[PDB]
Scaffold this active site. Sequence first.
Site, mmCIF file in Angstrom:
data_model
loop_
_atom_site.group_PDB
_atom_site.id
_atom_site.type_symbol
_atom_site.label_atom_id
_atom_site.label_comp_id
_atom_site.label_asym_id
_atom_site.label_seq_id
_atom_site.Cartn_x
_atom_site.Cartn_y
_atom_site.Cartn_z
ATOM 1 N N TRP A 72 22.775 9.937 -37.742
ATOM 2 C CA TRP A 72 22.029 10.537 -36.629
ATOM 3 C C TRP A 72 21.396 11.921 -36.905
ATOM 4 O O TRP A 72 20.561 12.026 -37.818
ATOM 5 C CB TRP A 72 22.720 10.356 -35.257
ATOM 6 N N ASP A 73 21.739 12.949 -36.125
ATOM 7 C CA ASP A 73 21.155 14.291 -36.323
ATOM 8 C C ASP A 73 20.891 14.570 -37.789
ATOM 9 O O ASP A 73 21.826 14.575 -38.593
ATOM 10 C CB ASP A 73 22.086 15.398 -35.840
ATOM 11 N N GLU A 335 20.262 21.294 -26.314
ATOM 12 C CA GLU A 335 20.793 21.023 -27.651
ATOM 13 C C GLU A 335 19.832 21.335 -28.803
ATOM 14 O O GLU A 335 18.598 21.411 -28.620
ATOM 15 C CB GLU A 335 21.236 19.550 -27.762
#
Length: 493
Positions: A72-73, A335
């Site tokens: 992910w990220d 975020e």
Amino acid sequence: LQDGPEPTIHTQQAYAPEDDFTAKWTRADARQLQRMSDPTAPSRENSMPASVTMPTVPQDFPDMSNEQVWVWDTWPLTDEDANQYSVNGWEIIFSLVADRNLGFDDRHVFAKIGYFYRPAGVPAAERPENGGWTYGGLVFKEGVTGQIFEDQSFSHQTQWSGSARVSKNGEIKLFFTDVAFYRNSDGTNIKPYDPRIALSVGKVKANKKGVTLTGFNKVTDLLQADGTYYQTGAQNEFFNFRDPFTFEDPAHPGETFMVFEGNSAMQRETATCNEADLGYRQGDPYAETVDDVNASGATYQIGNVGLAKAKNKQLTEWEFLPPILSANCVTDQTERPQIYFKDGKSYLFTISHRGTFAAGLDGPEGVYGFVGDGIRSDYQPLNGGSGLALGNPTNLNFLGGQPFAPDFNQHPGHFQAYSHYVMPGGLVQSFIDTIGTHDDFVRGGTLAPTVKMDIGVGGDPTKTAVDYSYGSEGLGGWADIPANKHLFTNGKF
């Protein structure tokens, strides 16, 4: 625009990094998101303006790691200007990864930082469909990242998102979120979790064989929530504190700054919003009362973007500065904040979910943007004061559903992309959470096609537009994290 409140007037005026001016993303501003939505949009169709909506990602997506891991990220190798680097002919990325055997939604508490590499400069269409990445494995050996926590009884220990600087001599400073969890077998806390902003230094070795990393054996504990500027566990069991992005500000040369996600430091259950937080123009017909907002539950959503300044040249010691943006009564979560520099302006980009919006507000999943004349300024939310830069295709007239349970009437790309990151030239990279309809959806765990967001339409620095000519119909290469600068170093293996 549907009728609604006017946006808050923002001056964009710069302040000193040390000042305690904190820009507000206001309920007035956030309500512009509803005004831009088309009320008549039918089931499963996007209601948001195309110019602020990420192109639709195909449900038939390739996987970047060939399903070795959930990914992910992701973040590139950068310098102090956020330029992205190849080393010895290799583009290199860091990504949160987890064991592919885990249920996708269980992976968060088993996150680790891994790295991928691929040949630099391969014609974008001569490249494999999946991006052509090679998974390099984990950055840290077992047991290294735990070393900063006095309390070793943790049930889970993760490495969460951050950023990575490369020096001209090939040194890598990895800034990350080092997190310890204290959970019972059912997920209930024994005590609040412990996320810390941390640093680990290593080196890149790169050959025609590929890339290996050495070092990353020591972790420095840099920052943890203080309780004056940034909410603590004591103040809030599920406080946010993570995502270091470091940079040099052109207006303050020779100094190093960091932005990070936080929450406003108020006691969770007695937190309140004021008139500034609401931000209405005098006698706007759509104004809310402070009492009405405070009674709605909106006060449980008090996210902020922090700022810190490095005390030494090694970047091993940091000093908290007051928050640069607060979304009190607007969202729980701003975020992966990043500062992006263009045409004399400071752009603060941040990522939010639909579900984290406070009662009375609503917006798509995706990138929210803010522009000012300094890193601390009276930030102007992009696009008509709304703050929206790049939303997933969203029918805002219908419920959002969840990534594990899409809503019957929602656009199937509602969860197509998260944790977006804005690269030079406004190219946006992100990972796939979920694509598909209520009864036919799949989870991603792999990067979406890179897309292009042009920043500042006309001469206007407050506006952005998706470029639908880029790649095929707006979609560029899968997992395309291109380097715009290139380094050659001693390091080999």
